[PDB]
Design a protein around this ligand. Structure first.
Ligand SMILES: CCCCCCCCCCCCCCCCCC(=O)OC[C@H](COP(=O)([O-])OCC(O)COP(=O)([O-])OC[C@@H](COC(=O)CCCCCCCCCCCCCCCCC)OC(=O)CCCCCCCCCCCCCCCCC)OC(=O)CCCCCCCCCCCCCCCCC
Ligand SMILES: CCCCCCCCCCCCCCCCCC(=O)OC[C@H](COP(=O)([O-])OCC[N+](C)(C)C)OC(=O)CCCCCCCCCCCCCCCCC
Ligand SMILES: CCCCCCCCCCCCCCCCCC(=O)OC[C@H](COP(=O)(O)OCCN)OC(=O)CCCCCCCCCCCCCCCCC
Ligand SMILES: CCCCCCCCCCCCCCCCCC(=O)OC[C@H](COP(=O)(O)OCCN)OC(=O)CCCCCCCCCCCCCCCCC
Ligand SMILES: CCCCCCCCCCCCCCCCCC(=O)OC[C@H](COP(=O)(O)OCCN)OC(=O)CCCCCCCCCCCCCCCCC
Ligand SMILES: CCCCCCCCCCCCCCCCCC(=O)OC[C@H](COP(=O)(O)OCCN)OC(=O)CCCCCCCCCCCCCCCCC
Ligand SMILES: CCCCCCCCCCCCO[C@@H]1O[C@H](CO)[C@@H](O[C@H]2O[C@H](CO)[C@@H](O)[C@H](O)[C@H]2O)[C@H](O)[C@H]1O
Ligand SMILES: CCCCCCCCCCCCO[C@@H]1O[C@H](CO)[C@@H](O[C@H]2O[C@H](CO)[C@@H](O)[C@H](O)[C@H]2O)[C@H](O)[C@H]1O
Ligand SMILES: Nc1nc2c(ncn2[C@@H]2O[C@H](COP(=O)(O)OP(=O)(O)OP(=O)(O)O)[C@@H](O)[C@H]2O)c(=O)[nH]1
Ligand SMILES: N=C(N)NC(=N)NCCc1ccc(I)c(Cl)c1
Ligand SMILES: [Mg+2]
Lengths: 97, 63, 320, 112, 459, 36, 347, 48, 51
C-alpha cells in the first residue's frame, strides 16, 4: 500500500575502491581499520601471546617437579618407599567397630 | 597477587560465609520453635489489652 | 498559570469572559461562492477573529515557525492532484479528505479554545460540521470507495460529538452554473477540470443534509450571491438573532471547563483521527513511516519540545 | 514501639555512611529518573533542567538514606531477638560434641 | 572482578557520548583494551582458586570462558556494523548497548561464588539475547524463535530456582567455596531424583541436550550474526559451566541418573551429525553441528573423571571459536547473496580465493584435525569414555567419520565445483571480513602451543 | 529489508478476542470512545 | 465533575481505606469499606455512558454483597467471643465468611468475574484506582486475621486465581482486560504466601502497585486502550515503547528486574516451610502471564506495526498529559532488584 | 522570534527554579546535620 | 581536548575498578599472617605481610 520500495543493495567499492569495508566515510573507514589491526593484532595477540608464554609457573607445575625430585632424592637416600598406599597416617584414623 | 595474600584472603572469605551459614541454620530453628510455642518475640499475635477493663464499682454488685 | 483545574478553581471561568458577542459563526457554500470575502467582512464589522479555511497546511501554520512544511510531512495529499486524477490508485482522494477533516477538527478546536479563553467570537469558513459534503460528492462521482465513507463516518462519530455547533451558520447559495462560470473566470488550471455533477452533489449535500440538520440546533442565515454582497445587511441580521436553539443554552462554567480541557490538548483532539482501521488509502507501512518520522525530527526546531531547541536560538536550556 | 519508623533504640546502631554503596545506587536510580523525565517530555536528555536533575538525585538519596537506616535496624533487631531466644532456651540449642574426619565414617563411592 | 565490570559498564557512556560516526571505532577499540586486560586472570594457582571477594571468584574453569567472553565483544561489533549501516543512530547505539549489557551479565555469571547470584545473572542473559533476536532479526519467524528460546529456558530454570533455594535452606549456604567443604552425599529417594532433575535440566536445555535442542536451530536461522556468535560461542557454555559446578553436590546419585542423558547424548551426536549431511540451510547446518559437539561435553561432564573434565573445558573453548567463525563465514556469503541456502552459490573458491582458505581452516578445526585444541578436547573425552565403557569407542569413532563428511561437504558444496552462472555480485572480500576471520582462527591455533590454559581446574 | 508487520499480521490483534470460537463469533470490538 | 468535588471524593476514597487500616474495631472496619465504596462509584460513572453505568452497577452489587457477608462474620464473631477487636476470629464459620467476603472484594477467583468487566467499563484513571488503591483495604484485613484463616481455603483461592488470571489474559486484546487478568493472577501470589510470611504479601503488594501504576500511567499518556492503539506508539513516542517493554518484562518476573523479587522471595518462604510442589506449580503457571506480556512487547516495541497517514499531524504537538511520578515509578518498576534486602523495612 | 507562538517554556519559571534549588539545598543540609547527630549519639551511647 | 575526551572513560573505569578491588582486600584481612601455612614473625621494619 503506502510503503517505500525496497532499496537496492549498495556496493561499498563503487564510491571508494580503496574501501576496507568498515565505513562509507573514507577517513573513518581507515581509522576503524587501524584500531582493529593495532589493538587486535599488534597488542592483544602479540603481547597477549608473549604474556601467556611467560606466566610465572602456571598452577605450580614446575614447583611440583622440583618438589618431587627433592622427595625422591631424600626417600631413596634413606631407603624409604618412593610412595605409600596410605595418604593419611593410620595412627590418626579410628575405624568403626 | 602473591599466593599468601590469596590464601589468607580465602580464609577471611570462608570465615564470613561459614558464619553466615551457621546463623542461617539457627534462624530456621529459632523460627520453628517460636512459631510452635509462641514463647518468643516473633509470631506474637495480639491479645486484648487488660488496661481497657473498667475496675470501678458497677451499678450492681456481682461482677 | 497554564489552564487547568487549579486555574479554574481560582476564578478562570468561561462565563466571566463570554459576553453577548461571544459567538462562533461559520460561513458555508459551494466552491467559488465568495464565502471567503463575506466571512472576512463579518469578522471585521463584528470585531471577531477570522479563521481562513483550513487547508492541507493548516497544522503547519500553528506549530514551529508557522511556515508550511514539505509535502512528505503532509502525506503527499494534493488538492491539485485530486482534480487531475480524482480516481488515482494511490488513494490520494480519500487521503486528502481524511487529512482535511483532521485539519478542520484541529481548527475548530483552535477556534473554540480562542472563544472560551478570551470571550471573543470567531468566524470560520466551513467546518467539521459541513466537511462531509465533499465526501458525499466524492463518493457519488465514484472517486472514493464505500469503505472510505465508512472510515470517515467512524472517525466523525467519535470526534464531532465532543464539540458544540456554531452559534450562527451563514450559507451563501450560488447556483451551479454561476459557480461553474466563476471557476472558469478564476483562471485556475486544475480547478477548471471540475465537473458540474461534482458541483451539483456538493450543493445537494448542503441542502439535503447540512442545512436541515443545522437548523435544528443553530441560527441559519441564507443568502444569494447578490444578497451576500451587502455585508452590513448580513451583519445586521446576525446582530438581531434570538438564540433560543442548540446546546449552547445548556452550557455552564462546569461543562465549559471540561470542553476547554479538551480543545487545549491537541493530541487529545486528534486522538481518534488515526484509529487503527487499516484502509489502503490512509495506511502507511512501517518503513516509510519510520524514515519520514526521522526526517521530521531533523527539521529546524523540531527535535525537541518547543523552547529546548538550541539550533533556533533557545536559551537557558539547563534551567528549563 | 508501635507505628514508629525508627524507634529510639535504633540510635545505638552506627549510621549508614554517606558513601554507602547502596546509597550510591539509590542516587544513581534518582539520576536515571531525571533522564527518563527529560526523554518522555522530549527535552535534551543530558543538558535539560539541571536544577530538576539535582533534585531527583537529592530526593532519592534523602529517602534512600532513611530506608537504609530502617533496613539495618530491622536486621539488628532480628539478630537481637534470635540470640536472646537461644540464650533463654539452651536445651533446644545444645552445644553438640564435634568429631574429626578421622573419627567419622563416610561411605566411599568410586567414580569408575 | 570490578576491574572488568566497571570498564565494561563504561563502554555504554562511551558509545552514547561518541561522535555520530565514531560509534563503531570507539566501542571496538576500547572493548579490545578490556579483552587485553582480561589476561591478568591467568594468575591461577595449583591448589587455591583466585578468590577476589565475597561475591566473585575465578578458577581455571571460568578464566578461559571469561577471556572468550571478553574477546567476543569486539568481534561481534565488527561482524554487525555492516548490516546495521542503514539503521538510525539511536538504534545502532541501543544495539551496541545490548551487546555490552550481555558481556556484563556474562562476566558476572562466570565469576559468581553464590549460586543464586549465578542463577539471576544466568537468567539475566535471556533479556538482551531475546531483544537482539526479535528486534534486529531479519525475517518473520524471529518472533517465534524468541518465544521458543525464552520458554524452553524458563521451563528449566524455574525448577532450578526452587531446587537452589531448597539447597540453601538445608545446607545453609550456596557459596561454592562452602559447598566444596559442606557437601553431603545424595541418598536414593524420589525426592532426590527430582532434586537432581531440577538441578540439571535447566543446564541441559542450554547445552542443548539432544531431544531438547530444537529451539537452537530456530534461534540461529533467525538471529542476526552477532546473536549467532554470542549464542554459539558463550551462551551454550552457560549450561556446560553450570553443570560442571552443580555436579559437585549431586553425588553419588549422578552414577545412575546420568544414564538416560548419556544415551541421549551418545546417540544424539550420531543423529545430529547425520542430519548435518542433509541440511539445506547453512546456518541450520552449523546449528546442528553445535548440538553434536555439545553432546560430547554433556557426556564428559556426566561421567566425572579428571580427563573428561579437561576434555569438556577444552571442547567448550574450541567449539566457541570454531562455531562463531563458521557463522561469520556463512554470514559473509549471506551479505552478498542474501540467502542461507547452501546450494545457491557454489564454486566460490574461484571468486574469493583467500576467503576459501578461511573456510578450509574453519572446517579442519570443526573435524578436529590434530593438534588443534578441538582435537585435544575431543580426544580427551574419547579416552575417558572408553574407560567408562569400551563399547563407546564405536559410537565415538562413527561420529568422527560423519563429522569429517559434513565438514568437508559444506566446504566442497560452497567453495568447489562450478560457480553459479547468474550470481554476479560476488565482490572481493573486505579487509573487515578477512580480519574478522583471522581474529577467530589465529587465537584458536595459537592455543595449540600452550593448551594448559584451557584445560580447566583438573589440569 | 528486515520484515515488519503488514496489515494482515496486524489484524490478528484487532479482533474482539485472540482465539475465535463458535460462541464468540458474534462478538464485536467495543466502540473507540467507549460510548454506545 | 467540579475539580473541588473530585478532590473531595478522592479524599473520601482514601479516608475509607485509612479507616480500615487504623481501626481496632470491626464496626469501624466495615464503615471504612462502606465509605470507600460510596465514594468510588462516582469516579466509575464520571463519563456517563451505558458501559460505565453497567460497570458501576456490577461493582455495587459485588461489593455490597461482600460487605453484607463481612458484617455477618463480624456478628457471628460477636456471638462467640463477645468482642469487636480486629484480629483473629473466634469461630470457624465466621472465618470462612470473612475470607470469602474479602476474596470477593479483592476479585480473586472464582469471585473474579467482575474485575475484567468493571475495569473495561471505566476510564483508565478509574481503573488505576480500582486495581491498585482498592487492594490496600482488603489486604490489610487479611494481614490481621490470617492466623484464623483456613489454610486449604486460602491456598485454593490462590491457586485458582493464578490459573484463571493466567488463562484469561491469553484471549485479550483490550488493554484494560489484560490488566484485570494480570491483577487476578497477582492477587494469587500475595495470598499464597500470606499463611507463611505476611511480610512477603506486603512486598508483593507494594511492587505490584508500583508496576500496575506505571502501566496505567503510560496507557493514559497516549490514550491507548487497545493492543492496536498501543502499537502506534513507536511512531509517536519511541521512548514510551522502551519503558513499556521494560515494565512488561518486569511484570513477567524476569531477572534482573524488580518484578522478579516478589516471586523470588515468595518461593523462598514456602520452601522454608517444606512447600515445594505449590511454588513450583505457581512459577510454571506464571509463564502464562509472561506469554501475553511478551505478545504486547512484540506489537509495541520489538516490531513496528503499520501506521496511518493522519499520524503525521500528531508529530507536531507535544505530550501534555501530567504523567505524574512516571519517571520515578518506571525506575522502581525495573531497577530495584539490587536493593531487595530492603524488604525488611516492611517487617 | 523563531516560534509562531510563544512556547510554554520559552523562559524559565524563575520561582520554580528557586524552589527547586532551595529544596535541594535544604535536604542536603538536613541530611548532613542528621548524619552528624546520628554519629554523635551513636558514640555517646557506646562510649566512644 | 573536547574531541578525544571520551577515550579516558574505559581506562578510568579500569583504574577505578582496580582501585576498588584493592580496597575490597582491606576488608578481608582477618587472617593476614595468621594462617598455619604462612604465619611468621614480622620483618624488622615490616608493618604487615601483604596489603
Ligand atoms: C530507597 C528505595 C529506592 C528509592 C526510593 C525513592 C522514592 C522516590 C523519592 C521521591 C521522588 C520525588 C520526585 C523527585 C523530584 C523530581 C521533581 C523535580 O525535581 O522538579 C522540581 C519541582 C518542579 O519541577 P517541574 O519542572 O515542574 O517538574 C518536575 C518533574 O517533571 C515532576 O514530575 P511529577 O509530575 O511526577 O511530579 C511529582 C512530584 C511533584 O513535583 C514537585 O513538586 C517536587 C516535589 C519534590 C519532593 C521531594 C521529595 C523528597 C523529599 C522527601 C521529604 O510529586 C511530589 O511532590 C513528590 C513528593 O520543583 C519543586 O517543586 C521543588 C520542591 C518544592 C517543595
Ligand atoms: C614455536 C614458537 C615458540 C613458542 O612455542 O612460543 C612459546 C610459547 C610456548 O612454549 P613454552 O610453553 O615452552 O614457553 C616458552 C617460554 N618459556 C621458556 C619461558 C617457558 O608459546 C605460547 O605460549 C603462545 C601462547 C598463545 C596462547 C595465547 C593466545 C593469545 C590469547 C588472546 C586472547 C583472545 C583469544 C580468545 C582466547 C580464548 C580463551 C583462552
Ligand atoms: C542503567 C541504565 C538504566 C537506564 C537509564 C535511563 C535511560 C536514560 C536515557 C534516555 O532515556 O534517553 C535516551 C537518549 C536519547 O537521545 P536523544 O537524541 O537526546 O532523544 C531524547 C529526546 N528528549 O539518549 C541520550 O542521548 C542520552 C545519553 C544516555 C543514553 C542512555 C541509554 C540508555 C540505554 C539503557 C539500556 C539498558 C542498559 C542495561
Ligand atoms: C507508588 C505508586 C504511585 C502511584 C502514583 C500515580 C499517580 C497518578 C497517575 C499519574 C498519571 C497522571 C495522573 O495524575 O493520573 C490521573 C488521575 C486523575 O484522573 P484524570 O483522568 O487524569 O483527570 C481527572 C479529572 N476527571 O490520577 C488519579 O486519579 C490518582 C489515581 C492513582 C492513585 C492510586 C495510586 C496507587 C496507590 C498508591 C499507594 C502506594 C502504596
Ligand atoms: C541496574 C540494576 C537494574 C538492572 C535491570 C535493568 C534495568 C534497565 C531497564 C531500565 C528501564 C528502561 C529504561 C531504558 C531507557 C531507554 C532509553 C533509550 O535507550 O533510548 C530510547 C530510544 C530513544 O527514543 P527517542 O528519545 O524518543 O528518539 C530518539 C532520537 N534520538 O527509543 C527508541 O529509539 C526506540 C528504539 C526501538 C526499540 C528498541 C527496543 C530494544 C532495546 C530495548 C532496551 C531496553 C530493554 C530494557 C530491559 C532490560 C535490559 C537488561
Ligand atoms: C526493596 C523493597 C522494599 C521497599 C519498601 C518501601 C516501602 C515504603 C517504606 C515504608 C516503610 C515502612 O515503615 O512501612 C512498613 C509498614 C509495616 O507494616 P505494618 O502493618 O505497619 O506492621 C509491621 C509489623 N511487621 O507497612 C507498610 O508501610 C507497607 C504497606 C503499604 C500500604 C500503603 C498504604 C498507603 C496509605 C498512605 C495514606 C496516606 C496517603 C499517601
Ligand atoms: C544535578 C546533577 C546533574 C549531573 C549531570 C552531569 C552531566 C551533565 C551534562 C550537561 C551538558 C550536556 O550537553 C549536551 O551533551 C551532548 C553530548 O555530551 C551534546 O550532544 C551530542 O549529540 C551527539 C550525540 O547524541 C554527538 O554529536 C555529540 O556527542 C554531541 O554533539 C550536546 O551538544 C550538549 O548540549
Ligand atoms: C454463605 C452461607 C451463610 C450461612 C450462615 C449461617 C449462619 C452460620 C452460624 C454459625 C454459628 C455456629 O457455628 C458453629 O457453632 C458450634 C457451637 O459451638 C461450634 O461448635 C462445634 O464446632 C467445634 C469443633 O471443635 C466445637 O465447638 C464443637 O465440637 C462443635 O459443637 C462450631 O465450631 C461453630 O462453627
Ligand atoms: N476535496 C476537497 N476539496 C476541498 C475541501 N474544502 C475546499 N476544498 C477545495 O478547495 C478549493 C478552494 O476552496 P473554496 O473556498 O471553496 O473556493 P474559493 O474560490 O477559493 O473561495 P470562495 O470563492 O470565496 O468561496 C476548492 O476547489 C474546493 O473544492 C474539502 O473539504 N475537500
Ligand atoms: N511469619 C513469618 N514466617 N515471617 C516473619 N515475619 N517472621 C518473623 C521473623 C523475622 C524475620 C525477619 C526479621 I528483619 C525479623 Cl525482625 C523477624
Ligand atoms: Mg475560499
Amino acid at each position: 500500500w503506502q510503503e517505500d520500495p525496497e532499496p537496492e543493495d549498495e556496493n561499498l567499492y563503487e564510491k571508494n575502491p580503496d574501501s576496507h569495508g568498515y565505513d562509507k566515510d573514507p577517513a573513518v573507514d581507515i581509522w576503524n581499520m587501524r584500531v582493529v589491526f593495532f589493538f587486535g593484532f599488534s597488542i592483544v595477540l602479540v603481547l597477549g601471546s608473549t604474556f601467556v608464554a611467560y606466566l610465572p609457573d602456571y598452577r605450580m607445575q614446575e614447583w611440583a617437579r622440583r618438589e618431587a625430585e627433592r622427595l625422591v632424592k631424600y626417600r631413596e637416600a634413606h631407603g624409604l618407599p618412593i610412595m605409600e598406599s596410605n595418604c593419611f597416617d593410620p595412627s590418626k584414623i579410628q575405624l568403626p567397630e | 597477587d602473591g599466593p599468601e595474600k590469596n590464601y589468607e584472603r580465602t580464609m577471611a572469605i570462608l570465615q564470613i560465609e561459614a558464619e553466615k551459614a551457621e546463623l542461617r541454620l539457627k534462624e530456621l530453628e529459632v523460627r520453628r520453635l517460636m512459631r510452635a510455642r509462641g514463647d518468643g518475640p516473633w509470631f506474637h499475635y495480639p491479645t486484648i489489652d487488660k488496661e481497657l477493663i473498667d475496675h470501678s464499682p458497677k451499678a450492681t454488685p456481682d461482677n | 498559570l497554564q489552564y487547568g483545574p487549579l486555574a479554574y478553581i481560582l476564578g478562570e471561568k468561561a462565563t466571566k469572559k463570554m459576553t453577548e458577542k461571544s459567538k462562533l459563526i461559520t460561513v458555508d457554500g459551494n466552491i467559488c461562492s465568495g464565502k471567503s470575502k463575506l466571512a472576512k467582512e463579518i469578522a471585521e464589522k463584528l470585531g471577531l477573529k477570522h479563521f481562513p479555511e483550513a487547508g492541507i497546511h493548516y497544522v503547519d501554520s500553528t506549530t514551529g515557525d508557522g511556515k508550511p512544511l514539505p509535502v512528505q510531512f503532509s502525506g503527499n495529499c494534493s488538492l491539485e492532484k485530486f482534480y487531475d486524477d480524482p480516481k488515482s490508485n494511490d488513494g490520494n482522494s480519500y487521503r486528502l479528505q481524511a487529512w482535511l477533516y483532521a485539519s478542520r477538527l484541529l481548527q475548530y478546536a483552535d477556534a473554540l479554545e480562542h472563544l472560551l479563553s478570551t470571550g471573543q467570537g470567531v468566524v470560520l469558513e466551513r467546518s467539521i460540521y459541513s466537511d462531509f459534503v465533499f465526501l458525499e460528492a466524492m463518493y457519488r462521482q465514484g472517486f472514493i470507495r464505500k469503505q472510505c465513507v465508512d472510515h470517515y463516518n467512524q472517525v466523525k462519530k467519535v470526534t464531532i460529538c465532543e464539540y458544540l455547533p456554531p452559534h450562527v451558520v451563514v450559507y451563501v447559495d450560488v447556483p451551479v452554473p454561476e459557480v461553474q462560470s466563476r471557476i472558469q473566470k478564476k483562471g485556475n488550471p486544475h480547478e477548471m477540470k471540475i465537473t458540474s455533477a461534482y458541483l451539483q452533489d456538493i450543493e445537494n449535500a448542503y441542502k439535503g443534509t447540512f442545512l436541515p440538520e443545522m437548523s435544528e440546533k443553530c441560527e441559519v442565515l441564507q443568502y444569494s450571491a447578490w444578497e451576500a454582497q451587502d455585508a452590513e445587511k448580513v451583519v445586521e441580521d446576525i446582530e438581531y438573532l434570538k438564540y433560543d436553539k442548540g446546546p449552547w443554552l445548556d452550557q455552564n462554567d462546569r461543562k465549559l471547563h471540561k470542553l476547554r480541557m479538551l480543545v487545549q490538548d491537541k493530541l487529545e483532539v486528534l486522538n481518534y483521527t488515526s484509529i487503527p482501521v487499516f484502509l489502503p488509502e490512509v495506511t502507511v507501512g512501517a518503513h516509510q513511516s519510520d524514515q519520514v518520522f526521522q526526517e521530521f525530527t531533523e527539521l529546524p526546531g523540531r527535535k525537541y519540545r518547543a523552547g529546548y531547541n538550541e539550533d533556533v536560538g533557545d536559551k537557558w536550556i539547563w534551567l528549563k | 514501639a508501635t507505628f514508629q519508623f525508627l524507634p529510639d533504640e535504633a540510635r545505638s546502631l552506627p549510621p549508614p555512611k554517606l558513601t554507602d554503596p547502596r546509597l550510591a545506587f539509590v542516587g544513581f536510580l534518582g539520576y536515571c529518573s531525571g533522564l527518563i523525565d527529560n526523554a518522555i517530555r522530549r527535552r535534551p536528555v543530558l543538558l535539560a533542567g539541571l536544577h530538576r536533575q539535582l533534585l531527583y538525585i537529592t530526593s532519592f538519596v534523602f529517602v534512600g538514606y532513611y530506608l537504609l537506616k530502617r533496613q539495618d535496624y530491622m536486621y539488628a533487631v532480628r539478630d537481637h531477638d534470635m540470640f536472646s531466644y537461644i540464650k533463654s532456651h539452651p536445651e533446644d540449642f545444645p552445644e553438640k560434641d564435634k568429631k574429626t574426619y578421622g573419627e567419622v565414617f563416610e561411605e566411599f563411592h568410586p567414580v569408575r | 572482578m570490578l576491574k572488568y565490570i566497571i570498564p565494561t559498564i563504561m563502554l555504554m557512556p562511551l558509545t552514547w557520548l561518541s561522535k555520530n560516526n565514531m560509534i563503531w571505532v570507539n566501542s571496538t577499540a576500547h572493548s579490545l583494551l578490556i579483552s587485553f586486560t582480561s589476561l591478568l586472570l591467568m594468575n591461577q594457582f595449583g591448589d587455591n582458586s583466585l578468590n577476589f571477594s565475597l561475591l566473585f571468584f575465578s578458577d581455571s574453569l571460568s578464566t578461559p570462558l571469561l577471556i572468550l567472553t571478553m574477546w567476543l565483544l569486539p568481534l561481534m561489533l565488527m561482524a554487525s556494523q555492516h548490516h546495521l549501516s542503514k539503521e538510525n543512530l539511536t538504534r545502532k547505539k541501543l544495539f551496541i548497548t545490548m551487546l555490552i549489557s550481555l558481556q556484563l551479565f556474562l562476566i558476572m555469571t562466570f565469576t559468581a561464588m553464590e549460586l543464586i547470584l549465578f542463577y539471576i545473572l544466568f537468567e539475566a542473559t535471556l533479556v538482551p539475547t531475546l531483544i537482539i533476536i526479535t528486534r534486529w532479526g531479519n525475517q518473520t519467524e524471529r518472533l517465534n524463535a524468541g518465544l521458543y528460546f525464552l520458554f524452553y529456558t524458563l521451563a528449566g530454570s524455574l525448577p532450578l530456582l526452587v531446587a537452589l533455594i531448597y539447597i540453601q535452606n538445608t545446607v545453609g549456604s550456596l557459596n561454592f567455596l562452602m559447598l566444596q567443604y559442606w557437601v553431603q552425599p545424595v541418598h536414593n529417594s524420589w525426592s532426590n531424583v527430582f532434586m537432581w532433575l531440577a538441578c540439571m535440566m535447566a543446564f541441559m536445555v542450554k547445552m542443548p541436550l539432544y531431544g531438547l535442542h530444537l529451539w537452537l536451530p530456530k534461534a540461529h536461522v533467525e538471529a542476526p550474526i552477532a546473536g549467532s556468535m554470542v549464542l554459539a560461542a558463550v551462551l551454550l557454555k552457560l549450561g556446560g559451566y553450570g553443570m560442571l559446578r552443580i555436579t559437585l553436590i549431586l553425588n553419588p546419585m549422578t552414577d545412575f541418573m546420568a544414564y538416560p542423558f548419556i544415551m541421549l547424548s551418545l546417540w544424539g551426536m550420531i543423529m545430529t551429525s547425520s542430519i548435518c549431511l542433509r541440511q539445506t540451510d547453512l546456518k541450520s547446518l552449523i546449528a546442528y553441528s553445535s548440538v553434536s559437539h555439545m553432546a560430547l561435553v554433556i557426556v564428559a561432564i556426566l561421567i566425572q573423571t579428571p580427563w573428561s573434565y579437561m576434555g569438556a573445558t577444552a571442547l567448550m573453548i574450541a567449539h566457541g571459536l570454531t562455531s562463531s567463525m563458521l557463522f561469520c563465514l556463512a554470514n559473509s556469503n549471506y551479505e552478498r547473496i542474501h540467502s542461507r541456502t547452501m546450494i545457491l552459490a557454489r564454486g566460490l573458491q574461484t571468486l574469493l580465493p583467500l576467503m576459501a582458505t578461511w573456510w578450509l581452516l574453519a572446517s579442519l578445526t570443526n573435524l578436529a584435525l590434530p593438534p588443534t585444541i578441538n582435537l585435544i578436547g575431543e580426544l580427551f573425552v574419547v579416552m575417558s569414555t572408553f574407560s567408562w565403557s569400551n563399547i563407546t569407542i564405536i559410537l565415538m569413532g562413527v561420529n568422527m567419520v560423519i563429522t569429517a563428511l559434513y565438514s568437508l561437504y559444506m566446504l566442497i558444496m560452497t567453495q568447489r565445483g562450478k560457480y553459479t552462472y547468474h550470481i554476479n555480485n560476488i565482490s572481493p572480500s573486505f579487509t573487515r571480513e578477512n580480519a574478522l576471520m583471522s581474529l577467530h582462527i589465529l587465537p584458536l591455533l595459537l592455543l595449540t602451543l600452550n593448551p594448559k590454559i584451557i584445560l580447566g581446574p583438573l589440569y | 529489508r528486515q520484515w515488519q508487520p503488514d496489515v494482515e499480521w496486524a489484524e490478528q490483534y484487532g479482533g474482539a478476542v485472540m482465539y475465535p470460537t463458535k460462541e464468540t463469533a458474534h462478538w464485536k470490538p467495543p466502540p473507540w470512545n467507549d460510548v454506545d | 465533575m467540579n475539580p473541588i468535588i473530585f478532590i473531595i471524593i478522592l479524599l473520601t476514597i482514601m479516608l475509607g481505606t485509612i479507616i480500615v487500616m487504623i481501626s481496632s474495631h470491626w464496626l469501624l472496619v466495615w464503615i471504612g469499606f462502606e465509605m470507600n465504596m460510596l465514594a468510588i462509584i462516582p469516579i466509575m460513572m464520571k463519563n456517563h455512558n451505558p458501559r460505565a453505568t453497567e460497570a458501576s452497577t456490577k461493582y455495587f452489587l459485588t461489593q455490597s454483597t461482600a460487605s453484607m457477608l463481612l458484617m455477618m462474620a463480624v456478628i457471628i464473631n460477636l456471638m462467640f467471643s463477645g468482642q469487636w477487636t480486629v484480629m483473629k476470629l473466634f469461630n470457624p464459620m465466621a472465618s470462612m465468611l470473612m475470607t470469602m467476603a474479602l476474596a470477593m472484594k479483592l476479585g480473586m477467583a472464582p469471585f473474579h468475574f467482575w474485575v475484567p468487566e468493571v475495569t473495561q467499563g471505566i476510564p483508565l484513571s478509574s481503573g488505576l484506582i480500582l486495581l491498585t488503591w482498592q487492594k490496600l483495604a482488603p489486604m490489610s484485613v487479611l494481614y490481621q486475621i490470617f492466623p484464623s484463616i483456613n489454610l486449604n481455603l486460602i491456598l485454593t483461592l490462590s491457586v485458582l486465581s493464578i490459573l484463571i488470571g493466567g488463562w484469561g489474559g491469553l484471549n485479550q486484546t483490550q488493554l484494560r482486560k489484560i490488566m484485570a487478568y494480570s491483577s487476578i493472577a497477582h492477587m494469587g501470589w500475595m495470598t499464597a504466601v500470606l499463611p507463611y510470611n505476611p511480610t512477603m504479601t506486603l512486598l508483593n503488594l507494594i511492587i505490584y502497585i508500583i508496576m500496575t501504576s506505571t502501566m496505567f500511567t503510560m496507557f493514559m499518556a497516549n490514550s491507548t486502550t487497545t493492543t492496536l492503539s498501543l502499537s502506534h506508539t513507536w511512531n509517536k513516542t519511541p521512548i514510551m515503547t522502551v519503558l513499556i517493554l521494560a515494565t512488561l518484562l518486569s511484570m513477567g518476573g524476569l531477572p534482573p528486574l524488580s518484578g522478579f523479587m516478589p516471586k523470588w522471595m515468595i518461593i523462598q518462604e514456602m520452601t522454608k516451610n517444606n512447600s515445594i510442589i505449590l511454588p513450583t506449580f505457581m512459577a510454571i503457571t506464571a509463564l502464562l502471564n509472561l506469554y501475553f506480556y511478551m505478545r504486547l512487547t512484540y506489537s509495541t516495541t520489538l516490531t513496528m506495526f503499520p501506521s496511518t497517514n493522519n499520524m503525521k499531524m500528531k508529530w507536531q504537538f507535544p505530550l501534555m498529559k501530567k504523567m505524574t511520578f512516571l519517571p520515578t515509578m518506571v525506575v522502581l518498576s525495573t531497577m530495584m532488584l539490587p536493593l531487595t534486602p530492603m524488604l525488611s523495612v516492611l517487617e | 522570534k523563531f516560534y509562531i507562538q510563544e512556547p510554554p517554556h520559552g523562559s524559565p519559571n524563575w520561582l520554580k527554579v528557586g524552589l527547586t534549588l532551595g529544596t535541594s539545598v535544604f535536604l542536603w543540609i538536613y541530611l548532613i546535620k542528621q548524619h552528624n547527630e546520628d554519629v554523635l549519639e551513636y558514640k555517646r551511647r557506646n562510649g566512644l | 581536548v573536547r574531541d578525544h575526551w571520551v577515550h579516558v572513560l574505559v581506562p578510568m573505569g579500569f583504574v577505578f575498578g582496580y582501585y576498588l578491588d584493592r580496597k575490597n582486600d582491606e576488608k578481608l584481612t582477618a587472617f593476614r599472617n595468621k594462617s598455619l601455612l604462612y604465619k611468621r614473625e614480622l620483618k624488622p621494619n615490616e608493618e604487615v605481610t601483604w596489603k
